[PDB]
């Protein structure tokens, strides 16, 4: 939920920062300079991805042979569909009763 | 998502049950008013 989305956003931001640092290093070392030293840090950012790789290497890996999270748990979804259907049926019955009452006048 | 939809269906069931209770009071009232007269 929260932690999974946070780690995903963190990995996405890490990839974006790595791409930006690579582009900046290319633009700096292409033409003209001490700032090019920070370009080396871009390579360090690449190592961060490797750490993420390590983070993916020594990750959960529950089975690594099948798919986890058994069951879509959509029984609740089906129950909600039935509830909405009952609500619609009640609305239809109420509309019929209202038409009958209006005809009574 | 499970907890969210469980709360949603609980609210829906509560609303439907309140509707049934109000309609029950209404049907009792109207049936008593109707059966008191025979055309």
């Amino acid at each position: 939920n929260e932690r999974l989305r946070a780690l995903e956003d963190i990995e996405r931001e890490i990839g974006a920062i790595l791409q930006n640092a690579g582009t900046a290093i290319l633009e700096l070392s292409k033409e003209k300079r001490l700032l090019d030293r920070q370009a080396a840090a871009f390579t360090t950012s690449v190592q961060h991805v490797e750490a993420e790789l390590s983070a993916q290497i020594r990750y959960l890996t529950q089975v690594a042979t099948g798919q986890p999270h058994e069951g879509s748990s959509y029984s609740s979804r089906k129950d909600c569909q039935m509830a909405l259907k009952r609500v619609d049926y009640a609305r239809l019955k109420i509309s019929d009763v209202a038409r009958t009452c209006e005809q009574m006048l | 998502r499970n907890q969210q939809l469980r709360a949603l269906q609980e609210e829906c069931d509560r609303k439907l049950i309140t509707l049934r209770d109000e309609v029950s009071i209404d049907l009792y009232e109207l049936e008593e008013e109707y059966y008191s007269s025979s055309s």
Binding site: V87, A90, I94 | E11, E22
Partner: peptide
């Protein structure tokens, strides 16, 4: 008197049904 009572009961039931229609639309709005 019977007709008046029937009309009053019908009006009350119609008001209740309209209120329930409104709250049902509100609940379905989510």
């Amino acid at each position: 008197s019977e007709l008046q009572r029937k009309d009053a009961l019908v009006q009350k039931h119609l008001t209740k049904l309209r209120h329930w229609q409104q709250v049902l639309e509100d609940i379905n709005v989510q």
